[PDB]
């Protein structure tokens, strides 16, 4: 009953940000020290909680959301931020209680000649609500004329590849991101520190 944070952080494969993965963590002992003492993480930002105090707290559920974005977009995984990722791909609530953790994954997620398998949503009729997920591939109407599912003038495919090459600048290198959300409801608190 050790919380399976390994399965999330050390997953072989990570989701595209538009198709971000969520794992519900419950009914286990969480050793948060494995995370906050790690030298592996380039970002470790907590909101409404102190990372070192986490081993002292109990929650009903922990949600672990994970995906890949480029380095220069990690700043968008924060309450109240704007940009293509926060607006159209993965949106934190203004009142977020949790931690945003990221690390450079250039060694796994970049390939010589480019890895283009990680996508982001470039076009959308409106901003995502917090923790909304949109995996639709409907043709996006950018102009006054309906597309009727046909790409053309002002009628676009809504997703686009990141082009991750190991020689990219750090800003265009792939980062793996895990967002931990800490939920306290009127129920037994099933995820506690040691």
């Amino acid at each position: 009953n050790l919380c399976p944070f390994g399965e999330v952080f050390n997953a072989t494969r990570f989701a595209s940000v538009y198709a971000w993965n969520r794992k519900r963590i419950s009914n286990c002992v969480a050793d948060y020290s494995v995370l906050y003492n790690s030298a592996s993480f380039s970002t470790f930002k907590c909101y409404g909680v102190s990372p070192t105090k986490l081993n002292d707290l109990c929650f009903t559920n922990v949600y672990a959301d994970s995906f890949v974005i480029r380095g220069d977009e990690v700043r968008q995984i924060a309450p109240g931020q704007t940009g293509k990722i926060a607006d159209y791909n993965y949106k934190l609530p203004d009142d977020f209680t949790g931690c945003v953790i990221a690390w450079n994954s250039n060694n796994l997620d970049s390939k010589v000649g480019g890895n283009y398998n990680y996508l982001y949503r470039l076009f959308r009729k409106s901003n995502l609500k917090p923790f909304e997920r949109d995996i639709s591939t409907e043709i996006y109407q950018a102009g006054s004329t309906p597309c009727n599912g046909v790409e053309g003038f002002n009628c676009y495919f809504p997703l686009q590849s990141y082009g991750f090459q190991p020689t990219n600048g750090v800003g265009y290198q792939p980062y793996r991101v895990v967002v931990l959300s800490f939920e306290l409801l009127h129920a037994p608190a099933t995820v506690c520190g040691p």
Partner: nanobody
Framework: QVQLVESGGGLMQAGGSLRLSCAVSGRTFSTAAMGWFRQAPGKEREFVAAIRWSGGSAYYADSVKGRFTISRDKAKNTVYLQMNSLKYEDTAVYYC????????????????????WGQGTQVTVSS
């Protein structure tokens, strides 16, 4: 691993039709695209047509609009070029190509790189 195998082409009289087929093994092109290119002697390899694999929207070089049609059969994992109203200057080696890259604007497939190529098929248009 990934093979693009062309069939069809060869000799046809001007105003006639040919149909090129390109059978893909070892990959599907999902949200990216397949295309056709051609190379005449002394000339750079030039874009002919692209198709979004998932949704099937097509993009054409101006030089073949109203004459050539690109299409694909997902079940057969095959892309086609229907070449109608053949012109003498359509004579070239035709290549099918596959892109690894998902681009939002289909017109990007006229200029962005393709990582997978067929063997090349001679098309000759005669009087």
């Amino acid at each position: 691993q990934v093979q693009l195998v062309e069939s069809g082409g060869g000799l046809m009289q001007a105003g006639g039709s040919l149909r090129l087929s390109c059978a893909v093994s070892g990959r599907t092109f999902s949200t990216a695209a397949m295309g056709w290119f051609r190379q005449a002697p002394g000339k750079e390899r030039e874009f002919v047509a692209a198709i979004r694999w998932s949704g099937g929207s097509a993009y054409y070089a101006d030089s073949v609009k109203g004459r050539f049609t690109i299409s694909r059969d997902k079940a057969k994992n095959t892309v086609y070029l229907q070449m109608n109203s053949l012109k003498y200057e359509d004579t070239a080696v035709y290549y099918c190509a596959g892109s690894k890259i998902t681009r939002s604007l289909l017109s990007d497939y006229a200029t962005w790189p393709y990582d997978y190529w067929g063997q090349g098929t001679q098309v000759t248009v005669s009087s």
